[PDB]
From a paper:
We identified a new orthorhombic crystal form of the E2 domain of APLP1. The respective structure was built and refined to 2.6 Å resolution. Indeed, the N-terminal helix αA was not observed in the new crystal form (although it was present in the protein construct used), suggesting that it is rather flexible and becomes sufficiently stabilized only by certain intermolecular interactions. The apo structure of APLP1 E2 revealed an unfolded and hence flexible N-terminal helix αA. The folding of helix αA is shown to be independent of the other structural parts of APLP1 E2. A similar arrangement has been described for APLP1 E2 in previous studies and was functionally connected to heparin binding. Despite the similar overall topologies of these dimeric APLP1 E2 assemblies, the Cα r.m.s.d. value of approximately 1.5 Å (for helices αB7–αF) is rather large between the crystal structure described here and that solved previously. Beyond the differently structured N-terminal segments (N-terminal residues Asp292–Ile304), a high overall similarity of the heparin-bound and unbound APLP1 E2 structures was observed.
Residue numbers in the entry:
A (entry chain B): 305 to 492
B (entry chain A): 302 to 489
Write the structure that this text describes.
């Protein structure tokens, strides 16, 4: 599970780094106790030695976290994309069967819409997370999120357009689909 | 309660996320729905329509971050106070066991164990907070760097002073010295 591995990956890093930080803080404390009677100019330079070590360490933690986050986001989006495409191909296949079967078509469409529901939720959840901790960044992606939602809606519309090519089948399934579109917030 | 504080903070964050998401979801929906309606409209009307929704979202994003910041700062303040109280409660118990007539070795050890545990927790939280700020905001971490160092030294002193209160009773200190070192080894 991508969620499992990512969670414990952040955990291992939090643990590794908390030890390293403690060890540096430890060594910093020792050097102060050792140089407690040194002149002020001597003591300034010593602190600056350990501040320098911690800045590098802070930067490494920061870059480490950015990489962990971006890799995870890339994979989640990759999985969502693949679920959608796989579901589209399956749906297309149910449509193209001889003859088309309402059950198979319905189940296949159900998978496709569910993949798009997932894509919508993720798009909105992430936008909402960014707004919570970075309003300036949220303002910047605001229109791209909006655009993303339009792309999804247009996918759902185009898929419903394919089912409509078989008018009887579209009629036979319509009530169940309207129920599905309301529940997943995907229709028009 | 420490655990209650944790769980209550998660339900408080979760509930804020849900409420806000629903709000955002509706506005984004309305924003997508408004676009289909406005495709025929003049460019001035089209842009005004977008500016309407982007405006509503801007205040939302600001509210969201405002809520998140307030919630986080409150939780931070409480956790700190909780740790201070736990330390002070443990210190009193430790002194009570030492100042009792006469001291009982097993009680002094338990009281001590509770105090070091409190300081372990204090130290641990001090470190964790610092690390988290480093991962998300290197500039703030550089700022708080010296204070964390100072804080850890203060904790190091307290552990020594308490160990020094025990050593003031030489037989007691000898009776417990093998057990005391085990405690210190596992923690600090």
């Amino acid at each position: 599970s991508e969620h499992e591995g990512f969670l414990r990956a952040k955990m291992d890093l939090e643990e590794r780094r908390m030890r390293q930080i403690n060890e540096v803080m430890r060594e910093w404390a020792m050097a102060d106790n050792q140089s407690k009677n040194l002149p002020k100019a001597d003591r300034q330079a010593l602190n600056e030695h350990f501040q320098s070590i911690l800045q590098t360490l802070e930067e490494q933690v920061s870059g480490e976290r950015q990489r962990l986050v971006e890799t995870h986001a890339t994979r989640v989006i990759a999985l969502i994309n693949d679920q959608r495409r796989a579901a589209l191909e399956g749906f297309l296949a149910a449509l193209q069967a001889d003859p088309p079967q309402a059950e198979r078509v319905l189940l296949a469409l159900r998978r496709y819409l569910r993949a798009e529901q997932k894509e919508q939720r993720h798009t909105l959840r992430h936008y909402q997370h960014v707004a919570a901790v970075d309003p300036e960044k949220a303002q910047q992606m605001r229109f791209q999120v909006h655009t993303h939602l339009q792309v999804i809606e247009e996918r759902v519309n185009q898929s419903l357009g394919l089912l409509d090519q078989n008018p009887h089948l579209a009629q036979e399934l319509r009530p169940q689909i309207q129920e599905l579109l309301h529940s997943e917030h995907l229709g028009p």
